[PDB]
Every structure is written in C-alpha cells, then in structure tokens.
A paper describes a structure:
LmrR is a transcriptional repressor regulating the expression of the multidrug ABC transporter LmrCD. In the apo state, LmrR shows high affinity for the promotor region of LmrRCD. LmrR is a homodimeric protein with the drug binding site at the dimer interface.19 Central in this binding site are two Trp residues, W96 and W96′ (residue 96 from the other monomer), oriented face-to-face at 7 Å from each other.
Thus, W67 is not involved in drug binding. To investigate the importance of π–π interactions for drug binding, the electron density in the π electron cloud of W96 was modulated by progressive fluorination of the W96 indole side chain. By our method, all Trp residues that are present in a protein are replaced by a Trp analog, thus making the system most suitable for proteins containing a limited number of Trp residues. We obtained milligram quantities of pure, labeled protein, which allowed, for the first time, the crystallization and structure determination of a set of proteins labeled with mono-, di-, or trifluoroTrp. It provided detailed insights into the effects of fluorination on the binding interactions of the indole side chain.
Numbering used by the authors:
A (entry chain B): 2 to 68, 76 to 113
B (entry chain A): 4 to 113
Write the structure that this text describes.
Amino acid sequence: AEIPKEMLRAQTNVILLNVLKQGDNYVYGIIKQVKEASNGEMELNEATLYTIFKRLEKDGIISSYWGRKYYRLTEIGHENMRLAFESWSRVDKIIENLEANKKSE
Amino acid sequence: IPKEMLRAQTNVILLNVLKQGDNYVYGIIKQVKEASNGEMELNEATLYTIFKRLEKDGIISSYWGDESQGGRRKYYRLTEIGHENMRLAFESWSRVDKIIENLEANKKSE
C-alpha cells in the first residue's frame, strides 16, 4: 500500500509549485511549511528539492537569487500552472462523462 | 501542453475507462471519443504503447471474449493491483489537495 515513486514525485512537484505560488521562499522554509501544512506527515528532504528545482529552473518555471538562495515562480511558471489546471479540468470532465455514459447504458 | 502531461492524462483516462468495465481497444477509443465530445481521438498504436507498460507493471491484463455476434475480441481489464493503485492515487492526490489548502490557510494567518 505504498505510493509509487513516480507518483510521489509528481505530487511533490505540485506541492512545491503551490508553495512558490504563495511567495518567494528558501528550501528550509519550504520544507518546514510543508511539514506544518501536512500535520507533520510530509517531511521533504533537501536532495529531492534540489533535483526538482534544478529541473524547474532549467525549464524556466522558477528562478533564483541570493537574498541562502531564494526561489520564485516566473511568468512562464504561472502560465504553465494555468494551462495545467485548465487541461486537467477537461480531463475531469471526460471522466465524469465516462461515468454518466456508463450509468445511462 | 507538454507531451509528458498529455501522456499522464491519457494514462488516467484509460485506467478510468477500464475501471468502468473491461473493454476492447476499438470500444475504449470510441468511449473516450464520445466522452471528450470528439476532442480526444486516440489512435490504436498509442494504446498499445501504454498498455504494454501497464501490463508489464501488473496494472492491467487481457483475455479473449467470445462475442455473441460471432468471433472474438481481446478485452483489457484492470487487475486487483490496478484497482488498488487507483485507490491509493485517489487518496494521496486528495491529501495533496488538503495540504495545498492548508498552505494557503497558513498563509492568510500572517
């Protein structure tokens, strides 16, 4: 009953982007805030954040600066989150229709 | 929309088709086409690519179903492991939504 590793990575990506949507942040603060928001259950480790942030920065989704290193969501990242939400909204409607077409038949 | 994102979405849709009930490839494509109102017309070869991986991982299997109009179709089905993975996905993704809600609430506090 463990969550698949690929799925966990997808979830961790979403959580981190939503933290940075809250505001610019540093790794220690992010990990601490996620721990608080998860009632202590989700304790992310630095190594996973550094891997993820390197990719998000490469894809232009986030940027960084010294101010420890602070991270922020770019305009590209905000737009990408908007398009993802819209695209997954349409998927939710497809699944709803599959269920309704089932019950109808 | 990124190619990876489309693949993740196609995976979830196909698993949800099979959760509704066992089906064969032409039937699956038709049900997705109808449920997307024509917006998603999957090609067979993409399903075979995805189904090869899902069968390798024990998430789906296949069997021959005798058709009452004559002949046979290859049916795909979600396995007991596949059903459990979908249950854990729903629970863990639901929890992610709650964490994000909490991050926002903890934000407004200050």
